[PDB]
Structure formats: structure tokens, C-alpha cells
Amino acid sequence: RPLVALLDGRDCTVEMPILKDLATVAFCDAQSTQEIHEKVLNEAVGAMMYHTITLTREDLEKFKALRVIVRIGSGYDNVDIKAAGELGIAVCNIPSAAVEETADSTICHILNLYRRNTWLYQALREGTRVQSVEQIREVASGAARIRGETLGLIGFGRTGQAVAVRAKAFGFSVIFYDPYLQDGIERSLGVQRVYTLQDLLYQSDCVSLHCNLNEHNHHLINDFTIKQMRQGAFLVNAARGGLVDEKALAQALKEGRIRGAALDVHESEPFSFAQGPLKDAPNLICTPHTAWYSEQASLEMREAAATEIRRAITGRIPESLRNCVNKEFF
């Protein structure tokens, strides 16, 4: 029974029932590519992976039997999909198992910035005593009215559109920049479209990232482009760490140029409050890459990924695959 390996994980309890009858299911629990059993490199015909390891062209050249890689998740910046294609390896993602989870987590970050519920929680956990109304206004200082603010979305695909749908009923004006879309989505969903990053940053009170990380948007938010954001803007990133230069953001937060920032993703994961560029930065909310997570979403995506391996093993590659992302290079 062909070997199928989970590269950067242990737990295989959802995937095994779906695959046991067709494949030997194995795990490597690798945190880097040098930690992959040479049995896997020699024998594995299918691989499953999360976001916690990266496969370059040189890494892909080491696999002798591999025919399919399924990313259990939507983002696949961590795989050189062109190299994979040229090498005879199809790459697939699970694009839509966590769209609402991510969008709800994002709206939660934005609300945490405007209303300060997280910081106020932390204040109470540090023993702050808020007796009087002067004390309430003091500890909640900065909380702001949402009606009439502009929410600017960079990327207007699945997560970005989900965020827009939710944001309207709070009284946000929604505006998006997405240079790869055709004309029309803006008219369909009744939001405003701008045509440059600068226009988005200039017009936005709150900016939220919803684009895939690609060859052309590394450090999209940087020292130069942060200066183009409004004074006292909020920044939200529930997309990818590599989109934001953390050195520039640390500085902007410290000078008060950005009023507050909420990151679910970071340039180097796992995030710690005690290390890296944002070491002592005010007005920072972080979560440890959880925007996608819920009981139901995690079950949905692990079944979908296991299903995708099943199709590749019993079907044709890549015609049998539901969500192959490298057909152009295959």
C-alpha cells in the first residue's frame, strides 16, 4: 500500500480512517526538511503538510516517488509550486474550509482595536481598580466610534469578501485594493475599489491584509509604505507574516504613527512577546496563528485533505484533483 506521509505533524486520527484501506499513513513530525526519514524521501507517493515547514526546489529534488502534496490549509507560499510542477509533483490546497473562521477572527481583531476589550481584560488581570467614571474613561482611553470609519482591505478574495460582508453592519465604509481581480466584484458586493496601494493606505482608518504571500508582495507594508498610512491608523494582519516588515511596524507603533496593531501571523513563527522586532511595542495584540481554527473547520479540512490524497492515489493526476494549484507548471 503506497506510503503517504504527514511531514510536519504527529496526529493522523482524522486522515487514517479515510486512507487506511489504500495507503500506509505515516508521520515525520519534522520542523525542518533535514528531519525527514529517508524512507519518506525514497518511497512516499503522497505528502500532507501544514504551514510550519518550507519546501524549496532543492528539497523537492530529494523525493524519488512523490506525486502529490496536499497543503492542509489555504496558503501555499511555503512550497515552490513551480519547482514541484516541473518535477512531476502536483500541489493542492484546502481553499475554503476556514473562510468564515478567518473572517470572524479578523472582525474580532478590528473590534478588539476599536473597543479595547482585550487590553481592558489584561488591565483587570493586572489588578487595575476602575471605581469611578474618570477611571473608566482613563483605562478605556482610545476606544473609538466605528460608524463612518474606512476599512481598507488589501486582497479581496475569499477571506477579504467575508470580512466586507461582516463589516458593513458596523457602519464601516469598505474599500479594497486587489490588482489581480477583473472588473465587477466591487459592483456586485457594493463596496468601493481603489487601484493602487497608496490610495488604499491614504484613505483607510483601519487596514486589513487578506492577500496571499507571493513573489511580488514580500514586505508590502514596509518603512516607506507605512509612512503613507493615515496618522493613527490601525493595522490588522491575519494573512501572512512576510507581508509586514516588523521593524517598520515596531517603530510606527512606538512613535504613535499607528494607533494599534493586531497580528495573527508573524515573519518568524512561533511568535514570542520576549524576542524579535516587536519586543517592546505598545498597542499590540497578537494571537499564535489561530484565525483558521475551530473544532468544525479543522475536521472539515483534515477530511478534505485526506479525500484529496484518496483521489490522487485512485484517480488521475492532476484531473482527479479538486484543488490543484500548480496545473500551469505540472
Binding site: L6, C12, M16, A26, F27, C28, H37
Partner: peptide, 7 residues
């Protein structure tokens, strides 16, 4: 249980 191939 899956097959332990870790290092």
C-alpha cells in the same frame, strides 16, 4: 496509530 518516521 500512524507509522512513526520521526527523527
Amino acid at each position: 496509530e500512524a507509522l512513526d518516521l520521526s527523527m
